[PDB]
Design a protein around this ligand. Structure first.
Ligand SMILES: *[C@@H]1O[C@H](CO)[C@@H](O[C@@H]2O[C@H](CO)[C@@H](O)[C@H](O)[C@H]2NC(C)=O)[C@H](O)[C@H]1NC(C)=O
Ligand SMILES: *[C@@H]1O[C@H](CO)[C@@H](O[C@@H]2O[C@H](CO)[C@@H](O)[C@H](O)[C@H]2NC(C)=O)[C@H](O)[C@H]1NC(C)=O
Ligand SMILES: *[C@@H]1O[C@H](CO)[C@@H](O[C@@H]2O[C@H](CO)[C@@H](O)[C@H](O)[C@H]2NC(C)=O)[C@H](O)[C@H]1NC(C)=O
Ligand SMILES: NC(=O)c1ccc([N+](=O)[O-])cc1NC(=O)Cc1ccccc1
Ligand SMILES: NC(=O)c1ccc([N+](=O)[O-])cc1NC(=O)Cc1ccccc1
Ligand SMILES: NC(=O)c1ccc([N+](=O)[O-])cc1NC(=O)Cc1ccccc1
Ligand SMILES: *[C@@H]1O[C@H](CO)[C@@H](O)[C@H](O)[C@H]1NC(C)=O
Ligand SMILES: *[C@@H]1O[C@H](CO)[C@@H](O)[C@H](O)[C@H]1NC(C)=O
Ligand SMILES: *[C@@H]1O[C@H](CO)[C@@H](O)[C@H](O)[C@H]1NC(C)=O
Lengths: 81, 367, 367, 81, 367, 81
């Protein structure tokens, strides 16, 4: 396929070939990001900071939750047709 | 069996349709969420395998728990209460900054987005090795390392009541496509007069039956037994450049070397291919310099004429001949000189179009 | 009113002229500096609003103060004096590395440079949320978040006596250009024989009265009520590609799908557009496969013929017809096949120029 | 303007339009990076490190200060003409 | 003198051959390794100059030692033994992640790889200033800073018995090429009707005797006394674009301004070059607006006609004339309009090739 | 060489020239990354973590060591010819 002889006449050589393996994904596993830490051994010393953190998170999480609900609400069982 | 309500949804890409169906199959049942919510409330580890018999294991990760457990709790009766909250507040703001960067508005389509495990690194506490170890990756061989880093996650649930994000990952394994060969190409400069040129070819190409293709090496690792790519690497190549690689030297383009010099010699098949107009070539065995015929462009050095050659100051023993003695330039059809810089491409294209619009009016007048 | 001494300065870009005038209007008065210098000396916070009645509030940020106050001072009578200095020395060197990276020689033109608030993150202590909160940004809605992160700073004073840098920021607000519509384009592959093609169009284009334009989505966020860009996104589009989007199918270029397959179906206007030569299409309602006429290139699936279609294994209910039944390929003028890889562009351009220089000599000989 | 019918015949569809809003900057606010921290509660334990830090900073700050002075010294009040 | 066994090795690039020979000359002697191995075992500093009389100094760096010495050891009798190991374990995993990222499979060719000192930052403890100071770099002037950051390392030994990596660095010094001049180019828009255009030229070009060349400013710093580049910056420029810069205005391409406007004026040689069709130009001295002749494209403002000009609201005093009064557009040959966006280049190239294949068949039929 | 007059007629000016200096590397200096920290003042409290670290490092270091040996084993003194 590649004409090594003619390519070598214009200074081009192959310096290695290899087989080609691509990654395919299979099976499944659930991973959960727990956003709220366990703070009980800090005895309310972080109450203000935790409440502010929770409020900052809400702005980010609500649009994602809404986007996911927008899709799954259009996915029904077969016989609804 | 489920059906997508396409008239209701109206518009969606295949990627969104397929991820949406996958979302329905992989999301936790409505009461599996209530179980998970209660399990998360009662734990205190940075990473924890949540096992509820019957249901599958769920890997829970808490992004600031190691800091709370290792740094804040041991200080509980040596630092003030205000200081403890201030210390944690700095961590929470930095952690929120990462959540915002990854899950915020820069995330275009949460349903079909695939987040690499490495991009999740900060969301998972700044490192992913313990997560991967809990999933069974040992770190004992490089292939398992590459596969473990090829993991991608999809979002399947966002809990705004208890503030957690459920992701689904899949395990990469290698799919060898035995008919595709990846080839690494490497060029040496050659001389026409005092002008130093080289042929413009891709660094990697792929052969596939009848096809020569382009090859995107971005997502690939060149392991000793094969090229491992986490994504498709093959993409089309124009017929003209395929013809170049098939032996049509006139189809291969060429350009002048950048800077002062190019790669002026190379070892290949135990021979030395060298631009001996551009460097001193010398036979060490006999002590005699190797001149390049000025109507030749390269020298092909093998042990039939010089067992040990010196080339730009490096001494190399070579094997029996695998490349013919150089041919005269006049027996080689060189292709067009080009530049790949984008302004040069655009400026010369604009010129070519103008010359063609001129040429297109005269052959109507004369015909 | 001020005047620029242009004969003295000799050369300057408009960006430098305008920033220089802005520098004169926004820099602190000479004695406002003496006030600020004394206020900075007597504070000890990481961030502090410096209020001097009459003059405006000045936001002061100290990049290692949280570490000194939270980590070093509480250790003052438990760690040695040498260790305290060693601990702080590591922070100072890392902080200097950031000052050098941002304000050092890699900063080409300090007068007209605009530094994003996020690039200042490390100079401000590793996080910007508290700075933004002191300026009034709540983090309560995503738009205010995007605007807050679109803040850019200009340097207005560098104090080498007391080691501080005064920056001026401006607040972004949204300027809707009601005549510009941003359009997201999405293609599906089609088949000519066993060759799988797709049309090459931009991912985003903009319409603006008479114009179709290119659209750089880099600085944009696609909010539910509009595309929000922190920079100009519009840039010219060639007439030929505009003609393509205006219906001249012969002006649109095409290429072969990368890898194994393309996007082979899409939901649009409640219909399914599908390359049914490349995937199994089937009517779920009747149980009958949907064949693609080999002299057609796509199938337009609507509820008039199939209320519920199965397409590559996904079942989709569709609405009433919004796209005509596919036409024969022979009634569609396809445009040129191309590659967008840059070496292919350069190699084919070099060939085209050579063919044109040949063609340009013969029509002089014959005419 | 865009001919959706003919584009659909070659597999191209629009999957969304939106208005276009660009950010414009207005008003002003001064921000000061205080490079020298308050170290008095460290009782001279960081004297060597602070002096070295200050010396490293000078190399960076002096060229910027000079560039700013090079511009503002060419900006005079109107009647100097 | 050493010789490379080229028949045994079979294939190697010049970069690999030369680095391999360099590897033989710079690697530590076999028993220098045994000395180093014992010296490393008995030290406990983060960075340490290892002096063995006779042999050269070897700079040893330990990437987590500052943390162990400053944070863990002082806690030895206040925190539990489990906690100490957990604290260090987090650092070790993060450090291993950096070793893997830099020395793992993403490192294609360890023999010829050159790793910048800044890329080694995390492997050396998160900062490089103390390393550079031990080598003699003071940080006292910006040039020494640039040179110190241009240091590259080669791997010369990897010890799997005692877990250390020996690297060889070289010191950059400046090599002035007195015949090469770097030029910064800057354009202003001009008007044809209500269309606002600008000429497409590179931001930086280089002159070199007979040559005009492209200039890659990526690795360069524009110091007050010269352009300092850590890599070769020169690369070829097409003859056509060279002709453009040599005065052939018809060879220069042009495009329409992006967004709303271009750079519409500039100060050059103490004069103001301005697109006064696109902004208000006014003589401050006389109070009279400066109109742009509609058959002119630019205005060249100097003190012979207006000592103090107002231009888009900024007031600039100008010097004596250095640019002639604008000429009529009809006395200027403009070059081709182009787009540099890659899809536009590819689409127009495909069209040009098709038009040329048509044109190539008719001049055979008529001739 | 550059024709500033004709370029100015189409709005292009030079706003600065400079000489060109490139960095060349000379001399040599050895730098050693000591991967194994001194932990003796931690009295075996990190034994498990250190052993795991060492095992993770081996997977990375062995291929590099092998690549270096593959080259230097083909580099002999002159008279082996
Ligand atoms: C190897 O290269 C040479 C060109 O350097 C090719 O020879 C040309 O072939 C065409 C027709 O195929 C002739 O019209 C030219 O006159 C030939 N040129 C010369 C100098 O001989 C040769 O075909 C190439 N070999 C292969 C397999 O492609
Ligand atoms: C839609 O596409 C077709 C081409 O597929 C266009 O029809 C061509 O129009 C030109 C002149 O405008 C004729 O010379 C061709 O013969 C036509 N080709 C065919 C196959 O009919 C049609 O004009 C396009 N519609 C629009 C609005 O542009
Ligand atoms: C400066 O620009 C003009 C074009 O704007 C050049 O004049 C052209 O020169 C060619 C031949 O060299 C003539 O065929 C054209 O008729 C000329 N055009 C016009 C409008 O006069 C001029 O040569 C350029 N100067 C330089 C040094 O290149
Ligand atoms: N000519 C063909 O038959 C052709 C067939 C398939 C593909 N393909 O990529 O799938 C590309 C083709 N043509 C080119 O690439 C020439 C070219 C290259 C760059 C810009 C414009 C035109
Ligand atoms: N032809 C015109 O009238 C044209 C008008 C305006 C612009 N404009 O972008 O503002 C570009 C134009 N032409 C092209 O883009 C063709 C082209 C594309 C890539 C490379 C070279 C030539
Ligand atoms: N024509 C020549 O003599 C030429 C000589 C040297 C080089 N050189 O870069 O060294 C390039 C040359 N030609 C072009 O760049 C035209 C071009 C530009 C972009 C894509 C295809 C063709
Ligand atoms: C936090 O952790 C403690 C100890 O691990 C555990 O008993 C408790 O359930 C958690 N407490 C809360 C309020 O979540
Ligand atoms: C540092 O902080 C102290 C306490 O906040 C303050 O009183 C003092 O003015 C500052 N001291 C110096 C020398 O800047
Ligand atoms: C570690 O450090 C101690 C003190 O610096 C030194 O004496 C010793 O040689 C080192 N110990 C080991 C086992 O490497």
């Amino acid at each position: 396929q590649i004409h090594w002889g003619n390519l070598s006449k214009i200074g081009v050589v192959g310096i290695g070939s290899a087989s080609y393996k691509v990654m395919t994904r299979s099976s499944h596993q659930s991973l959960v990001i727990k956003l709220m830490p366990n703070i009980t051994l800090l005895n309310n010393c972080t109450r203000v900071e935790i409440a502010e953190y929770r409020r900052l998170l809400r702005t980010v999480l609500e649009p994602i939750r809404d986007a996911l609900n927008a899709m799954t609400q259009n996915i029904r069982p077969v016989q609804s047709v | 069996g489920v059906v997508l309500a396409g008239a209701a949804l109206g518009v969606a890409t295949a990627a969104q349709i397929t991820a949406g169906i996958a979302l329905h199959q992989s999301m936790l049942n409505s009461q599996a969420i209530d179980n998970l919510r209660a399990s998360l409330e009662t734990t205190n580890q940075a990473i924890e395998a949540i096992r509820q018999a019957g249901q599958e294991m769920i890997l829970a990760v808490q992004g600031v728990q190691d800091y709370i457990n290792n740094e804040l709790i041991p200080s509980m009766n040596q630092l003030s209460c205000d200081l403890i909250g201030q210390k944690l507040g700095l961590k929470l703001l930095r952690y929120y900054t990462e959540i915002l960067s990854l899950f915020g508005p820069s995330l275009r389509d949460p349903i079909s987005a695939e987040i690499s495990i490495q991009a999740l690194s900060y969301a998972l506490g700044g490192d992913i090795n313990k997560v991967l170890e809990k999933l069974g990756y040992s770190g004992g061989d490089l292939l398992g390392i590459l596969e473990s880093r090829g993991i991608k996650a999809r979002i399947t649930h966002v809990d705004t009541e208890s503030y957690f994000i459920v992701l689904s990952i899949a395990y990469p394994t290698l799919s060898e496509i035995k008919g595709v060969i990846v080839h690494r190409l490497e060029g040496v400069s050659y001389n026409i007069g005092s002008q130093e040129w080289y042929t413009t070819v891709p660094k990697y190409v792929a052969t596939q039956g009848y096809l020569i293709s382009n090859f995107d090496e971005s997502s690939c690792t060149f392991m000793p037994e094969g090229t491992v790519c986490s994504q498709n690497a093959l993409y089309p190549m124009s017929p003209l450049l395929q013809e170049c690689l098939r032996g049509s030297t006139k189809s291969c383009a060429r350009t002048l070397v950048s800077g002062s010099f190019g790669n002026r010699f190379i070892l290949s098949q135990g021979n030395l291919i060298a631009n001996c107009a551009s460097i001193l070539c010398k036979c060490y065995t006999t002590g005699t310099i190797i001149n390049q015929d000025p109507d030749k462009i390269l020298t092909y050095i093998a042990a039939d004429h010089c067992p040990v050659v010196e080339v730009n100051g490096v001494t190399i023993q070579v094997g029996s001949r695998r490349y013919p003695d150089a041919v005269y330039l006049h027996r080689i059809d060189l292709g067009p000189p080009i530049s790949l810089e984008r302004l040069d491409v655009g400026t010369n294209l604009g010129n070519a179009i103008a010359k063609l619009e001129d040429a297109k009016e005269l052959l109507e007048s004369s015909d």
